[PDB]
Design an enzyme around this catalytic site. Structure first.
Site, PDB file in Angstrom:
ATOM      1  N   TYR A  26      42.073  42.277  25.943  1.00 43.84           N
ATOM      2  CA  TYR A  26      42.957  41.388  26.657  1.00 43.84           C
ATOM      3  C   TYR A  26      42.400  39.974  26.704  1.00 43.84           C
ATOM      4  O   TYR A  26      41.179  39.735  26.628  1.00 43.84           O
ATOM      5  CB  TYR A  26      43.208  41.873  28.091  1.00 43.84           C
ATOM      6  CG  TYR A  26      42.044  41.677  29.021  1.00 43.84           C
ATOM      7  CD1 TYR A  26      41.920  40.562  29.859  1.00 43.84           C
ATOM      8  CD2 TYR A  26      41.023  42.631  29.070  1.00 43.84           C
ATOM      9  CE1 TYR A  26      40.832  40.405  30.691  1.00 43.84           C
ATOM     10  CE2 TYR A  26      39.928  42.441  29.918  1.00 43.84           C
ATOM     11  CZ  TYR A  26      39.847  41.349  30.723  1.00 43.84           C
ATOM     12  OH  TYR A  26      38.749  41.243  31.548  1.00 43.84           O
ATOM     13  N   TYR A  82      47.333  37.988  42.349  1.00 45.51           N
ATOM     14  CA  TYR A  82      46.396  37.621  43.427  1.00 45.51           C
ATOM     15  C   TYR A  82      47.106  36.931  44.587  1.00 45.51           C
ATOM     16  O   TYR A  82      46.391  36.482  45.526  1.00 45.51           O
ATOM     17  CB  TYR A  82      45.246  36.786  42.887  1.00 45.51           C
ATOM     18  CG  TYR A  82      44.423  37.476  41.833  1.00 45.51           C
ATOM     19  CD1 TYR A  82      44.688  37.342  40.492  1.00 45.51           C
ATOM     20  CD2 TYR A  82      43.406  38.309  42.183  1.00 45.51           C
ATOM     21  CE1 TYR A  82      43.945  37.962  39.524  1.00 45.51           C
ATOM     22  CE2 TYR A  82      42.618  38.972  41.258  1.00 45.51           C
ATOM     23  CZ  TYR A  82      42.911  38.797  39.927  1.00 45.51           C
ATOM     24  OH  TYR A  82      42.138  39.446  38.986  1.00 45.51           O
ATOM     25  N   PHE A  99      48.918  37.610  30.493  1.00 45.85           N
ATOM     26  CA  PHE A  99      47.901  38.375  29.783  1.00 45.85           C
ATOM     27  C   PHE A  99      48.439  38.822  28.426  1.00 45.85           C
ATOM     28  O   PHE A  99      49.545  39.347  28.337  1.00 45.85           O
ATOM     29  CB  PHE A  99      47.473  39.630  30.546  1.00 45.85           C
ATOM     30  CG  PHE A  99      46.630  39.321  31.771  1.00 45.85           C
ATOM     31  CD1 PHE A  99      47.223  38.951  32.957  1.00 45.85           C
ATOM     32  CD2 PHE A  99      45.269  39.368  31.759  1.00 45.85           C
ATOM     33  CE1 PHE A  99      46.438  38.720  34.071  1.00 45.85           C
ATOM     34  CE2 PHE A  99      44.506  39.087  32.859  1.00 45.85           C
ATOM     35  CZ  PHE A  99      45.098  38.840  34.060  1.00 45.85           C
TER      36      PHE A  99
END
EC number: 5.2.1.8
Length: 107
Positions: A26, A82, A99
């Site tokens: 990733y 987050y 991502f």
């Protein structure tokens, strides 16, 4: 919370089950495109157990939608990342993350 867009198709058949270890490569990026973290830079795949909640919610819901061999862009809202606090210094408050994830294998 997470939107998946395929970069390269997988097998279209082998999707992770709860409790399996997902082995991925990733790269994570803020909305401005600046990479903050990458297994590709470390040159070592990253492993997590699906359902353990050891990665953000948009990973467990996004990678669960991927099949082995698939590479995909996961666009993750702060709600699934987050949130309001972020991770000060690295992830700002209320940040949307992108991502680029490749699901290598399941273990």
């Amino acid at each position: 919370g997470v939107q998946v867009e395929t970069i390269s198709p997988g097998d279209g058949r082998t999707f992770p089950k709860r409790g399996q270890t997902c082995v991925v490569h990733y790269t994570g990026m803020l909305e401005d495109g600046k990479k903050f973290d990458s297994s590709r830079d470390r040159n070592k795949p990253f492993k997590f157990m699906l359902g353990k909640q050891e990665v953000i919610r948009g990973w467990e819901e996004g990678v669960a939608q991927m099949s082995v061999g698939q590479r995909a862009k996961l666009t993750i809202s702060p709600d699934y990342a987050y949130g309001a606090t972020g991770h000060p210094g690295i992830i700002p408050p209320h940040a949307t993350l992108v991502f680029d994830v490749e699901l290598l294998k399941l273990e």
